[PDB]
């Protein structure tokens, strides 16, 4: 009986997403330090991508609300909204 090892990758149906945060600068949060905070808390790249918006290179839509409010308590529950897709 032969003696061999094979490795391969097989796509899943689950998509890779990107997480977009808009409105931080309206609470007079600085988008640059917001970007770097997100980068480090999530261990994942991020960039300011609009004039008030930051894009994080993963799906963090579960935590992202609580994380935002922990770090910036100004942001009350009636002013941060999870859109969807």
Instruction: Please report, for residues 19, 33, 46, 58, the alpha-carbon distance to residue 39 in angstroms, rounded to integers and kept in the order given.
Output: 12, 10, 6, 10
Task: Kindly state whether residue 59 participates in binding Hg ion, applying the rule CB under 5 A.
Answer: no
49 binding Hg ion? (CB under 5 A): no
Q: Are 25 and 63 in contact (CB under 8 A)?
A: no
Question: Per CB under 5 A, does 69 bind Hg ion?
Answer: no
Q: Report, in Å, the least distance between residue 50 CB and Hg ion.
A: 5
**3-state class (DSSP) for residue 47:** strand
44 binds Hg ion (CB under 5 A): yes
Q: Which residues bind Hg ion (CB under 5 A)?
A: 22, 44, 53, 57-58
């Amino acid at each position: 009986v032969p003696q061999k090892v094979t490795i391969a990758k097989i796509p899943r149906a689950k998509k890779k997403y990107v997480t977009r945060v808009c409105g931080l600068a309206t609470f007079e949060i600085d988008l640059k330090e917001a970007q770097r905070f997100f980068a480090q808390k999530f261990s994942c790249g991020a960039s300011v991508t609009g004039e008030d918006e930051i894009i994080i290179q993963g799906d963090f839509t579960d935590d992202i609300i609580d994380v935002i409010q922990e770090k910036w308590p100004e942001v009350d529950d009636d002013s941060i909204e999870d859109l969807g897709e």
